[PDB]
Design a protein around this ligand. Structure first.
Ligand SMILES: Cc1cc2nc3c(=O)[nH]c(=O)nc-3n(C[C@H](O)[C@H](O)[C@H](O)COP(=O)(O)O)c2cc1C
Ligand SMILES: CC(=O)c1sc(Nc2ccc3ccccc3c2)nc1C
Ligand SMILES: CCCCCCCCCCC[N+](C)(C)[O-]
Ligand SMILES: O=C(O)c1cc(=O)[nH]c(=O)[nH]1
Length: 364
């Protein structure tokens, strides 16, 4: 709905008026009510991707964290996303961290957040998704799949049981599930990425998933940090292949603060997202793709705000990409912008479609 107006006039006006959390809440409300122009960009056949046992009309999804509670799914498809991921959802409802807990860094086109898994909980989200389950079944059939991202409660003793509960409750409503072991905002969570902990956790998750009826049986992906050692990455790749994990989401936000950040709020605690994350995420995709021999589908995420950003991740090995932070600066028009630029670049670089470009850098 006109990039130039939103990017230069409307979005800076919303930014100037509202604190970032209030802006987020308003964005979810507006989106869920369908108060957005229905996006005019028609997805061309060259954007279609077949992966994770599904057809994706285009490879650009909304990352987890925007719609934590499954309130705005239909409005997100209307915005032009090829797939929607909701969550993270925790088993019991929980408030998350005290405010303020989200910070804009406009000079860096970055955000820092420390939400800490504010979640309505499995029960509430389950009912919300059940109320539109058949509509989603038709959307998925039409190439618009739904992912559900699972987290764990702050005070839970048994992390694996939290994730298992999510698989049992929301697995039947999802095209894919995400085991989020990479939030920087829940104490101890990232240690679940370690080899032995990950293996134990994912064995249980996969056992639970395999016990679901065939038509309600989702793909299972693991979402990983951009801050892992080489050893961590080798270990993850090994466990993923040992267990037959269906895919990886690469990456969550970073606890690093790259040299050069200008924002006044750069030293706030939390995960950093947006442009300063972009190439760190792209390099993690590149490494994970090589470690899995290109055989494990990757959803690439972190700092995507253009067609070039999307294509760099795809050529590095991503089958699909997501964005979030760019929406907070450019607004809804960024979605069509990314898709139009991606298509133009695929054509310029001689690819027949997205599928041909996946991992292309590794064959160079
Ligand atoms: C405010 C905010 C909340 C987020 N919440 C979640 C979450 O609950 N679960 C999750 O897996 N990732 C979460 N993320 C991470 C995003 O899904 C994504 O991995 C990261 O922000 C990098 O993409 P981006 O640069 O396009 O935002 C959140 C990110 C932001 C900015
Ligand atoms: C953290 C976050 O999601 C919000 S979202 C946002 N701005 C808006 C504001 C309005 C929006 C309307 C539709 C879609 C996205 C929108 C984004 N700013 C922030 C800081
Ligand atoms: C019942 C447990 C309360 C969970 C509160 C989570 C915040 C409420 C709405 C979240 C919107 N966010 C703040 C995610 O935009
Ligand atoms: O809820 C959060 O704090 C959160 C979760 C997550 O996975 N990533 C993130 O940046 N924030």
């Amino acid at each position: 709905g006109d990039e130039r107006f939103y990017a230069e006039h409307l979005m800076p006006t919303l930014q100037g008026l509202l604190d970032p959390e209030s802006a987020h809440r308003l964005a979810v409300r507006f989106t869920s009510l369908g108060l957005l122009p229905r996006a005019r960009f028609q997805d061309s056949d060259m954007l279609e991707v077949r992966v994770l046992g599904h057809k994706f009309r285009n490879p650009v999804g909304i990352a987890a964290g925007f719609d934590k509670h499954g309130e705005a799914v239909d409005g997100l498809y209307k915005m032009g996303f090829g797939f929607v991921e909701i969550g993270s959802v925790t088993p019991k409802p929980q408030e998350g961290n005290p405010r303020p807990r989200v910070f804009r860094l406009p000079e860096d086109q970055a955000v820092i957040n420390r939400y800490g898994f504010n979640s309505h909980g499995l029960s509430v989200v389950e009912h919300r998704l059940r109320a539109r389950q058949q509509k989603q079944a038709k959307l998925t059939e039409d190439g618009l799949p739904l992912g559900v991202n699972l987290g764990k409660n702050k005070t839970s003793v048994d992390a694996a049981e939290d994730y298992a509960e999510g698989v049992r409750v929301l697995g039947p409503l999802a095209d894919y599930l995400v085991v989020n072991v990479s939030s920087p905002n829940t104490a101890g969570l990232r240690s679940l990425q370690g080899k032995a902990e990950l293996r134990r956790l994912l064995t249980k998750v996969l056992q639970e998933r395999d016990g679901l009826r065939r038509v309600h049986r989702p793909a299972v992906l693991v979402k990983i940090a951009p801050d892992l050692t080489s050893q961590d990455k080798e270990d993850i790749a090994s466990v993923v292949k040992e267990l037959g994990i269906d895919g990886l989401i690469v990456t969550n936000t970073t606890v690093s603060r790259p040299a050069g950040l200008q924002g006044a709020l750069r030293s706030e605690t939390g995960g950093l997202s947006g442009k300063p994350l972009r190439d760190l995420s792209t390099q993690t995709i590149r490494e994970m793709y090589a470690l899995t021999q290109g055989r494990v589908p990757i959803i690439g995420v972190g700092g995507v705000s253009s067609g070039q950003d999307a294509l760099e991740k795809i050529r590095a090995g991503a089958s699909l990409v997501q964005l979030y932070t760019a929406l907070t600066f450019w607004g809804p028009p960024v979605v069509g912008k990314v898709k139009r630029e991606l298509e133009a670049l695929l054509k310029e670089q001689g690819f027949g479609g997205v599928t041909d470009a996946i991992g292309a850098d590794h064959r160079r």
